[PDB]
C-alpha cells in the first residue's frame with residue numbers, strides 16, 4: 001500500500017538558495033490527491049510530460065489555419081500559477097509528437113518553406129500568446145541537433161522543408177509573443193563531445209547575432225554507468241561560457257541499466273540502487289558549484305513506476321527518487337545529503 005512520508009525534507013526547500021527543483025508530470029497527477037500533495041511538497045517547478053507538446057495542443061487545421069485544444073494544458077498552467085510554482089513549457093518545436101498533417105496543407109500536400117514558416121509563426125504566437133506571463137521558461141526547440149550529420153542538424157521534416165532557419169525564427173517569434181519568458185534550446189546527449197560542440201556553436205552563433213535565446217536545457221537522461229559527472233560538468237562549463245545563457249537540467253533521470261543492455265530485473269537490485277544514490281550525490285554536489293548558471297533541475301517523473309523508461313525500453317526500471325509506493329529511495333537521501 002502507499003507509503004508517502006509527508007514529513008521528510010522537501011527537495012526544493014533543501015535547494016532553495018541554489019536552484020529550483022522541478023518534476024515532469026502527466027495530467028492524471030493533477031487529479032490525484034497523493035500525487036498533487038507530493039508534487040507541491042517537493043517541487044517548485046513542473047513540466048507537463050506530454051500535455052504541452054504539439055500533438056496535444058493541436059486539434060486540426062482548415063484552409064485558414066490551425067485549430068487548438070487547450071483545456072488540459074490550461075489545467076497545468078493554472079495549477080502552477082495558483083500554487084505559486086513555475087511551469088516550464090515543453091515544447092514548441094520538435095520532430096517528435098507533432099502530427100505529420102502539421103507539415104501539409106488542407107489537401108494533404110507538403111507545405112512550401114514559406115507556408116510552413118508562416119504556420120510556425122501562427123502556432124508560436126497562438127500558444128505562447130495564450131500563456132503570456134504565466135510560463136516562466138519555454139523549451140522553444142527540442143532535439144534539433146543530430147551529430148551523425150556533417151553539419152549537425154537533424155534531418156527532420158522541419159529541416160527538410162525550412163533549412164536551419166526554423167530554429168532562429170522560432171526563438172524570434174516566441175520572444176515577440178512573450179518577451180518575459182526565458183527561451184531554451186533543449187537536448188539530450190550533451191555529453192557526446194561532437195554533439196555538445198554542435199549545440200554549443202549553434203546557440204553561441206544564434207546569440208551572437210541577436211537571436212533571443214536565453215538558455216540551454218540539458219535533458220540529462222543518463223544511467224548509473226554513463227556519462228560521468230565530470231563529463232556533465234564539462235558540458236556546463238562550455239555552455240556557461242556563452243554570455244547571457246543560463247542552464248536548466250530539464251529531464252533528469254538515471255536508469256539502472258546500461259544502454260542497450262539485455263539485463264531485465266523484476267525488483268531493483270540494491271547494489272544498483274546504491275550506485276544510483278552515489279551518482280546522484282556526486283551530480284548534485286557538482287551542480288551546487290554552478291548555481292551562477294544552473295537555475296533549475298527538473299526530474300523526468302515523480303516516482304519509478306511513472307517513468308517513461310518503462311515503456312521506452314519495455315522493462316521495469318527505477319530511475320527517480322521515489323519508489324512505486326511513494327517512499328524515499330537511497331537516491332532521495334543522497335540528494336538531500338548533497339544539499
Ligand SMILES: O[C@@H]1[C@@H](O)[C@H](O[C@@H]2CO[C@@H](O[C@@H]3CO[C@@H](O[C@@H]4CO[C@@H](O[C@@H]5CO[C@@H](O[C@@H]6CO[C@@H](O[C@@H]7CO[C@@H](O)[C@H](O)[C@H]7O)[C@H](O)[C@H]6O)[C@H](O)[C@H]5O)[C@H](O)[C@H]4O)[C@H](O)[C@H]3O)[C@H](O)[C@H]2O)OC[C@H]1O
Nearest residue numbers: 049050096142188189192219221222223226251258259308
Ligand atoms: O504512446 C505515447 C507515448 O509514446 C508517449 O510517451 C512520451 C514520450 O515522450 C516522453 O518525453 C520525452 C522523453 O525525453 C525526451 O526525448 C527522448 C530523450 O531520450 C532519447 O533517447 C536517448 C538516447 O541516448 C541514450 O544515451 C545513450 C547512453 O549510452 C551512450 O553510449 C555509451 C558510450 O560510452 C560507453 O562506454 C557506454 O557503454 C555506452 O552506453 C550512447 O551514446 C547514448 O546514446 C539516452 O539514455 C536516451 O535517453 C529519446 O530518443 C528521446 O525520445 C523528450 O524531450 C521528452 O519529451 C514522455 O516522458 C513519454 O510519456 O506518451 C503518450 C503516449 O500516447
Ligand SMILES: O=S(=O)(O)CCN1CCN(CCS(=O)(=O)O)CC1
Nearest residue numbers: 233237285286288289290291292293
Ligand atoms: O571547484 S570546481 O573545480 O569543481 C569548479 C569551480 N568553478 C569556478 C568558477 N565558478 C563560477 C564563479 S561565479 O560565476 O560565481 O562568479 C563555477 C565553478
